[PDB]
Nucleic acid binder design. Structure first.
Ligand SMILES: [Mg+2]
Ligand SMILES: [Mg+2]
Ligand SMILES: [Mg+2]
Ligand SMILES: [Mg+2]
Ligand SMILES: [Mg+2]
Ligand SMILES: [Mg+2]
Ligand SMILES: [Mg+2]
Ligand SMILES: [Mg+2]
Ligand SMILES: [Mg+2]
Ligand SMILES: [Mg+2]
Ligand SMILES: [Mg+2]
Ligand SMILES: [Mg+2]
Ligand SMILES: [Mg+2]
Ligand SMILES: [Mg+2]
Ligand SMILES: [Mg+2]
Ligand SMILES: [Mg+2]
Ligand SMILES: [Mg+2]
Ligand SMILES: [Mg+2]
Ligand SMILES: [Mg+2]
Ligand SMILES: [Mg+2]
Ligand SMILES: [Mg+2]
Ligand SMILES: [Mg+2]
Ligand SMILES: [Mg+2]
Ligand SMILES: [Mg+2]
Ligand SMILES: [Mg+2]
Ligand SMILES: [Mg+2]
Ligand SMILES: [Mg+2]
Ligand SMILES: [Mg+2]
Ligand SMILES: [Mg+2]
Ligand SMILES: [Mg+2]
Lengths: 50, 99, 62, 69
RNA sequence: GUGAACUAUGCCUGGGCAGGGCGAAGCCAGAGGAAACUCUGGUGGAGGUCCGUAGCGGUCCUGACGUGCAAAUCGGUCGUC
RNA sequence: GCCCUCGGCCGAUCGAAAGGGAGUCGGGUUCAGAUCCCCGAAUCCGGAGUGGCGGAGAUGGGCGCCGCGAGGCGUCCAGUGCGGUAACGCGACCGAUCCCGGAGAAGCCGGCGGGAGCCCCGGGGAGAGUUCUCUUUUCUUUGUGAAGGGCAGGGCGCCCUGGAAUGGGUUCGCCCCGAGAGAGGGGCCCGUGCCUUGGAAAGCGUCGCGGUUCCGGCGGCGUCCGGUGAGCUCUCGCUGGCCCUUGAAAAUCCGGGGGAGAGGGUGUAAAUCUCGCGCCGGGCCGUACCCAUAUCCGCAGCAGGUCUCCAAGGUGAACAGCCUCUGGCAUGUUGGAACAAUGUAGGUAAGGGAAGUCGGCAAGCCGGAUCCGUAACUUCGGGAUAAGGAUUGGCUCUAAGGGCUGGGUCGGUCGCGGCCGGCGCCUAGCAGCCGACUUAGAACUGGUGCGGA
């Protein structure tokens, strides 16, 4: 809702800050074995439990 | 009430005739729902060789004037070039559509 | 144009009305209008002394 | 906004300390003198042209006498 | 141990519910009687009142659908308002 | 700091983004934010020891002289304002503990009235549309926020004079009156309406001039005059009805009673001030967007579910249905071509008319309104739209139903108009003007159609 509390705004701020793709130099790092961010959230598919 | 109706440009380039347009108004005016005879001499139309004054002593209306000149332009197949605007109070001046 | 015709009385009919007579023109509104008219007339007559208090009261009650 | 009736009252509020500005608005029928002070905008309306002119002459110095044209 | 975000019921604080029909008490007038009163015409606008919207519900078609639009929905017809 | 005096919030605290709760509006601006940014107008709360400036408190009388007198001299005594018979008013107009009250703070339903907004009608503009014929036409547009001041309007069981039956005022309904009617004169409250300040400089509509790759450019003209109403929707008010139902509390703010106290010795004074102006400040958190036949829940862009606000024209009883404007959309997760059966949904059907079937299931019939006319039975309320019948279009008329004004005998003289009077009898009222929607009747008319969907 538009009526938020400060700490639910902080929670959503953290979640949308970390819903972000992986950088591309990570793949060039030695011994990487990670291809994409595997825990990306889409707002329509998987909902925050909050 | 001196509803000066002014058309210098079209008679300037010779595409309409002020005399027969004055005749058109002289027949098809209305005063209390009567055509011809100017209500019985109660409205007076003079043409000063480039424009027409329609002096009167009754509550006659210039929106009726604009309606009649639009009717004349439509009848003589002219209102794709000409356009009746209010250049001032108590007067209507025809203008050409953008060049 | 149809409002002008209905002013002259056209399309008012008996096959043109769908609500009841009280729905189209209420009897309470009719009676209220009549009482206001007649009471105002009685008050004017009493003011101009065409009638007096006693005639006014009997005519008011009637 | 306050509306002032007399020239003497207008002059003392014009020479008041907090009087920030004066704007002169020339209307068709009259002239308005709007002095901007701290809390209110005060307006004086004059119908006489020569009286408005001599008031413009007799306005105290050290003020903004801005015409609105 | 965890649940009354559904539902059941109480409480607190808010929101909502066209248009019409019938015409209770109270009241005004006229007429008839010795009274008691009676009759007539209005006025008035009552009711877990009636027809019927929104809303709430869910009768029947044992209609549609029945690997559905839907792990109970849809249409017409209905109940109440 | 100690002592004295006084003291129930007698119970922490939490609990509402719909209850209570001071005080912000107009215009502009973005790719996306605005009552939050910019511009312009305000306002509330808190603060002021040296008090910031005004104004109020507050500045008058008595007696002796001088001085023509005015006016001065000295002495003595007041002064916590004043007006109105009153309701109450005025710009301030001392005052504590304590006490009393009020506001916050009251249901649902009905009926009327006032105000606005919307809708509607008649003209004037401006710009568009139609012009085969007609149409002085059709469509669009035709502003003034908050906060001050003034005036309408509405309301008042508020005041004074006076005394009412031949009872009278008065509402749609009521209701009111010797516990004070009608009448006459006032007062208060509300004022969201109008005028003004704001305010035309802005906005809007048109007509133009020049380019800062896009100026809150620059200019002209305009933004006018009226009328209706059981209209609808808000809102304010009055008065009823209903209830073995009587429809919060508290923060918070105000008024009064009382008078412990405080203020100065007559000064160009004090205490004090809910008056006017001025000065400073207002932190913290939310604020985008969706709000649902695609942003939520139902595993999904799911025919389900999910609380609200605003609400145009026509027909019509109507927020019914049907069509249209503002706004919105692209047919609901695809298209093309054919038009078999069987379906699903919708129609029609000769003659019969429930013979069908468990069963009139389903479908059909009926339907609105106006005028008649309505049975048994009954708890006397009802039954009841019982049952039954007639009418219904279009067009042209005729009646009836209202609201404003003025009805004046004569200069007997002058303040072609005015002061007092000889001067005169609509008194069954007329005369003029304005304005609605209805209802009833009649004629004509149509391929008997007319609640035509
Ligand atoms: Mg979801
Ligand atoms: Mg619950
Ligand atoms: Mg009922
Ligand atoms: Mg229903
Ligand atoms: Mg169903
Ligand atoms: Mg079935
Ligand atoms: Mg019912
Ligand atoms: Mg205690
Ligand atoms: Mg709390
Ligand atoms: Mg709250
Ligand atoms: Mg937005
Ligand atoms: Mg204004
Ligand atoms: Mg009285
Ligand atoms: Mg302008
Ligand atoms: Mg312009
Ligand atoms: Mg928003
Ligand atoms: Mg859905
Ligand atoms: Mg789930
Ligand atoms: Mg449809
Ligand atoms: Mg389709
Ligand atoms: Mg498609
Ligand atoms: Mg879809
Ligand atoms: Mg058959
Ligand atoms: Mg047959
Ligand atoms: Mg059978
Ligand atoms: Mg059989
Ligand atoms: Mg058989
Ligand atoms: Mg059936
Ligand atoms: Mg029966
Ligand atoms: Mg007929």
């Amino acid at each position: 809702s538009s009526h938020k509390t400060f700490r639910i705004k902080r929670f959503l701020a953290k979640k949308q800050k970390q819903n972000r793709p992986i950088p591309q130099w990570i793949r060039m790092k030695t011994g990487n074995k990670i291809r994409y961010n595997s825990k990306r959230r889409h707002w329509r598919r998987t909902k925050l439990g909050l | 009430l001196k509803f000066t109706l002014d058309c210098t440009h079209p008679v300037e380039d010779g595409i309409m005739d002020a005399a027969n347009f004055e005749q058109f108004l002289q027949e098809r005016i209305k005063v209390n729902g009567k055509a011809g005879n100017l209500g019985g001499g109660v409205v007076t139309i003079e043409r000063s060789k480039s424009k027409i004054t329609v002096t009167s002593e009754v509550p006659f209306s210039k929106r009726y004037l604009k309606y009649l000149t639009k009717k004349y332009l439509k009848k003589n197949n002219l209102r794709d070039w000409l356009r009746v605007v209010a250049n001032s109070k108590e007067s209507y001046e025809l203008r050409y559509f953008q060049i | 144009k149809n409002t002008l015709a209905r002013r002259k009385g056209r399309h008012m009919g008996i096959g043109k009305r769908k609500g009841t007579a009280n729905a189209r023109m209420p009897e309470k509104v009719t009676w209220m209008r009549r009482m206001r008219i007649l009471r105002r007339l009685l008050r004017r007559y009493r003011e101009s002394k065409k009638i007096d208090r006693h005639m006014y009261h009997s005519l008011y009650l009637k | 906004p306050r509306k002032i009736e007399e020239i003497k009252d207008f002059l003392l509020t014009a020479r008041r300390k907090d009087a920030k500005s004066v704007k002169i608005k020339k209307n068709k029928d009259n002239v308005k003198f709007k002095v901007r002070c701290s809390r209110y905008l005060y307006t004086l309306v004059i119908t006489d042209k020569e009286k408005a002119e001599k008031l413009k002459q007799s306005l105290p110095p050290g003020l903004a006498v801005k015409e609105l044209k």
